[PDB]
DNA sequence: AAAAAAAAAAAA
């Protein structure tokens, strides 16, 4: 069945960067197939897709409506498999004779032209027969590479609710999070989750650390590991003329290459992970960072005298 | 049955782009059989073609007549699955028996010969028998490759309507979609969709997501998403010896390569996904895009560190 | 009884390209198995075989004859039919028992030798008795293979009639219709449907569009249609040394190749189909399209070079 | 009764190739069962068997006798019939009491026992009681597979005579009927007839033809048809170093291998019908065309490229 | 007692 009753729509904190895909949803449920027929929610990694898709799928469940949960690649996957095995009809009709049908991680649909096709007909018959639809993915329907343009207008054409995890948000999160596990609030705990925690995921994570070897513990490691990394304020700020907030927030040849530099050196001494840096950097996606570090590497007149220096100067006084 | 009582004669917001197909439909249901014998409605993708199949079967229903709604694949699938099990029979005589056809989606007929011949047969002794047949499609049948030109024929020798979204009709349907909302008399609003739809489900789409919302918030996202993709009057239209406007429409080695540029760009450092940047070009189709990028690789002399200096510059002021 | 009264010998426009079919049918409407006893009219598609047939029916009606209408494929499902359920006496029966037989479409009995042997029966009894028989196909019985040479023998063995239509016909034919619809005597109009209609079905519907959307209307989409395909003369006719008029007929390595190149450069940048290649140059059954095509790809030295060099010239300066 | 007057034994022109046939018969009805009491007729299609014992029938009558005429196939299935219906006394009585019995279309009594039984009774009663038998059939006894030896011993032990239409004949037959059709034995006329038909059917057929739209109509249509698939003489007979007289004409890896590469060709490009193809080599059965066709494509080393070649030349320099 | 014709086509 796949529908793993612990994700409810009670235990989805609710806050301002999720209280429109919440509410949709919800308010969806009450009325199957009658309004909101097409959901699509979307959102950054860790942002609580599945769960708001579980939990609609576990209400419908409780109220006696047939329901299918299933991922984009699972999909396709139970198809071929049906196609191989030629019991593809049993495979269709078990799919449209759904009351709620739950699509998680649509973007998976890239490539696969049967699969869209298969799923076309599915969305289409449950559409007119006025079944609910939800489908959920880590990007909008625009940004759909390698999508049947007819599936995308679709998607459009329904509810587009995105999820954001803002500030205002994340915070509401962290606090009843803690409250649920029987944790106390201190500010310094909060005030460094909100620091260090990014998406729901990683303050699930922290957390369950924090219940496990208490606050002081992780403190420490990661200071270490995050200012062993600060070497930008101690060398790269001070040799070249410029500001570390300002070499931290993007915004020109002054301080951008700056930057480059930082990234590159921490890469090539401290040994550090994209990833780390990444993170380090207050960068996302961490794209730039190599895109950067492959920057750094090509523009190499005299410039790698200069790298060179730097580079002797941060393993002497960096280690 | 299949016939979604939501899409009605009534609901359909006519302009000057639908108008004709609209009244022929309307006044073949008028007279069934009588004139107008073989309907075949085309257009491009959500342009109305199945609200308006969907409401002439309903009017049918409402007068008493035998009607069957199908999309061309679902005909295909259903008359393959007949085959296994070898009920053909009753699939064709069901069929057959019909006062009024309505055959979505025609352009899926193309590779299946089976198909094309029952549809073909179906076709006929429906034809002859003077009933009702109504076909749609989001291609002229010349464009239809890999259908029988025997289908061909009869479907050009019957009435072709074209259903074409110029801007007087996006209009008065915008209007007319935004007066269910009591959201009309909004200068903002219409404007604003008037730029940014090109089709009646992204109107749907949009207006739906005002009403939940708001436009204040859409008109920010959808603001800065854009002009961090205007990167082009910035930087390609002042270094290449170029307008905007006139690298916004086509129309010769002195902008046209500014534009192939432009794409290539896009694609590279913002990470733009190939329907926005389409989007933002006021390109259609998403295909000139594509091979307009594969054609700046191509001609990758010295082009080449022309495009890497462009990058850079690109990368360092655009992030 | 699937004969429709709408077909009738009146409504038959003759011309210099039908009158011999059209003339054999009513004189043998006359009298009937006397004369002309196995009548067998072939034709391109979209020739008036179907009408002539149904009007000969009509006509026997009219007179008191036992008459039946069927395709060939009907005759075979319907046979198989009444094998499955085991009524087939009652089936030859009622076949063998008319004063008239038409066979459309038969051509359709390929294949299916049970079929071609119960037909054969029939046709001998018919025949045998003096009763008349009237068969119509889009190929000469030679054309006809999957078809037992009996069965050929007898076809070619009675009146064989083609129903070729020139240029003296169809103007007889479009302006007779054009008197149809009481729209009528332009000389823009006629000389438009005779550079732009092969066959009957494509000046009916053409004349339709024109009584509904104007003359004006599809003049403009047509023409631009179709000159943003005359890429020939632009590219391909300047280009290679040769004349445009040659490169639309036929007939040797000095025009030729410079086709085949036209016919896959319209195929791949201006994204045409092959019906719509094909109808461009003149060309007929989008045969020698396809097969030229592959032709160009095959041969695929640095002919290649040239080939890409086209294309962006052909993207550049075609949109 | 199924004695169609129009066949008589006055109407059949006799020739060296069907006055052994004919004379025979005559003298068979001259003295009833005295003589050439099992009567077994055979020749290739449209030879005049029906016609031959229509004739017979119709003297018979003409004089007083007892006659039935029957095919095969329909004894096959009235015999059915009458076994369903459990009339099957009726029936054998209602054949045993026959003065003369005319069986056309022997060869369909492969494959069906219980009818060979039932005609083999039959046979027997009316031979003892001295009663005439007159049988026609497309192949000799001995070509009948799945025929009970009894039944080919007793059509051996008859009298066996064959219809052979040489040249001598065809052109007494075509003469003839020309006289009949108020035609007058113009000299290209007859030459033509003989060049282009086999057997009788092919006759009347052109000649109705020539009665209808003259001469020098088909003679084009014909003639072109015929010489745009006479790509051996210029392409085939050249490339490979033979004559064409030969190579129409069987009879050795130098000259044969140039047919099978000829018929190949004209199926592949001129899409010539096998029974195009057949007509052309002057082949008979159309079977050496399909084997050969098959054969030419089974030895497909480096054939293949030459293969090629010789394609491309076609499609280029055949039309 | 003899014995009909035969669909479309995964991702990597
Ligand atoms: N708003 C919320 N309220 C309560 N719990 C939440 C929540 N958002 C996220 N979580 C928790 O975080 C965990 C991960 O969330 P979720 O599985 O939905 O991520 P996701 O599927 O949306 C991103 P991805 O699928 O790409 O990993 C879940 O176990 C869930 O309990
Ligand atoms: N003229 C009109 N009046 C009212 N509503 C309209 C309309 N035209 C389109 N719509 C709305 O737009 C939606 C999509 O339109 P439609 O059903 O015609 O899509 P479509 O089938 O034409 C595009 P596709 O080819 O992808 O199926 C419908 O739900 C319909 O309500
Ligand atoms: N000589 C004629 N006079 C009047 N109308 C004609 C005509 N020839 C063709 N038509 C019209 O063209 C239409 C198509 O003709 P028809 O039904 O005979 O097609 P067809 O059966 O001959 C070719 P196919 O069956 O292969 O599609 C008919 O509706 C008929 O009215
Ligand atoms: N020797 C002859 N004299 C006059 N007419 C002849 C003839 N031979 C053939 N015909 C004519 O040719 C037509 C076909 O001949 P016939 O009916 O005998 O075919 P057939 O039965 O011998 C070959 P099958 O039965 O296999 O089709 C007949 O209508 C007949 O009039
Ligand atoms: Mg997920
Ligand atoms: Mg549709
Ligand atoms: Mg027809
Ligand atoms: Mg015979």
């Given at each position: 069945?796949?529908?793993?009753?612990?994700?409810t729509?009670?235990?989805?904190?609710?806050?301002?960067?999720?209280?429109?895909?919440?509410?949709?949803?919800?308010?969806?449920?009450?009325?199957?197939?009658?309004?909101?027929?097409?959901?699509?929610?979307?959102?950054?990694?860790?942002?609580?897709?599945?769960?708001?898709?579980?939990?609609?799928?576990?209400?419908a469940?409780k109220?006696?409506?047939?329901?299918?949960?299933?991922?984009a690649?699972?999909?396709?996957?139970?198809?071929?498999?049906?196609?191989?095995?030629?019991?593809?009809?049993?495979?269709?009709?078990?799919?449209?004779?759904?009351?709620?049908?739950?699509?998680?991680?649509?973007?998976?649909?890239?490539?696969?032209?049967?699969?869209?096709?298969?799923?076309?007909?599915?969305?289409?018959?449950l559409?007119?027969?006025?079944?609910?639809?939800?489908?959920?993915?880590?990007?909008?329907?625009?940004?759909?590479?390698?999508?049947?343009?007819?599936?995308?207008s679709?998607?459009?054409?329904?509810?587009?609710?995105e999820?954001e995890?803002?500030?205002?948000?994340?915070?509401?999160?962290?606090?009843?999070?803690?409250?649920?596990?029987?944790?106390?609030?201190?500010?310094?705990?909060?005030?460094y989750?909100?620091?260090n925690?990014?998406?729901?995921?990683?303050?699930?994570?922290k957390?369950?650390?924090?219940?496990?070897?208490?606050?002081?513990?992780?403190?420490r490691?990661?200071?270490?590991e995050?200012?062993?990394?600060?070497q930008?304020?101690?060398?790269?700020?001070?040799?070249?003329?410029?500001?570390?907030?300002?070499?931290?927030?993007?915004?020109?040849?002054?301080?951008?290459?700056?930057?480059?530099?930082?990234?590159?050196?921490?890469?090539?001494?401290?040994?550090?992970?994209?990833?780390?840096?990444?993170?380090?950097?207050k960068?996302?996606?961490?794209?730039?960072?190599?895109?950067?570090?492959?920057?750094?590497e090509?523009?190499?007149?005299?410039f790698?005298?200069?790298?060179?220096?730097?580079?002797?100067?941060?393993?002497?006084?960096?280690?």
């Amino acid at each position: 069945d796949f529908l793993n009753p612990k994700y409810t729509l009670e235990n989805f904190i609710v806050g301002e960067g999720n209280r429109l895909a919440y509410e949709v949803v919800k308010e969806a449920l009450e009325n199957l197939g009658s309004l909101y027929n097409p959901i699509f929610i979307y959102g950054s990694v860790g942002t609580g897709k599945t769960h708001l898709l579980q939990a609609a799928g576990n209400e419908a469940k409780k109220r006696g409506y047939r329901v299918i949960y299933s991922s984009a690649d699972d999909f396709a996957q139970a198809m071929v498999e049906h196609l191989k095995k030629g019991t593809i009809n049993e495979f269709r009709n078990m799919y449209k004779s759904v009351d709620l049908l739950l699509l998680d991680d649509v973007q998976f649909l890239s490539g696969k032209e049967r699969t869209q096709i298969e799923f076309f007909h599915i969305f289409n018959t449950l559409y007119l027969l006025e079944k609910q639809i939800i489908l959920a993915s880590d990007r909008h329907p625009q940004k759909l590479d390698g999508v049947s343009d007819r599936l995308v207008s679709r998607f459009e054409g329904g509810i587009l609710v995105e999820i954001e995890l803002d500030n205002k948000t994340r915070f509401k999160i962290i606090k009843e999070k803690l409250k649920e596990f029987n944790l106390e609030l201190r500010k310094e705990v909060i005030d460094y989750l909100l620091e260090n925690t990014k998406n729901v995921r990683e303050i699930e994570g922290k957390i369950k650390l924090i219940k496990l070897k208490g606050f002081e513990g992780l403190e420490r490691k990661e200071r270490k590991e995050r200012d062993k990394l600060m070497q930008i304020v101690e060398f790269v700020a001070n040799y070249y003329a410029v500001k570390v907030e300002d070499i931290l927030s993007d915004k020109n040849k002054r301080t951008s290459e700056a930057r480059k530099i930082a990234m590159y050196l921490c890469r090539k001494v401290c040994s550090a992970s994209l990833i780390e840096i990444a993170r380090a950097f207050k960068r996302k996606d961490h794209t730039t960072v190599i895109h950067a570090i492959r920057s750094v590497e090509e523009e190499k007149r005299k410039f790698k005298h200069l790298v060179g220096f730097l580079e002797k100067q941060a393993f002497d006084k960096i280690c």
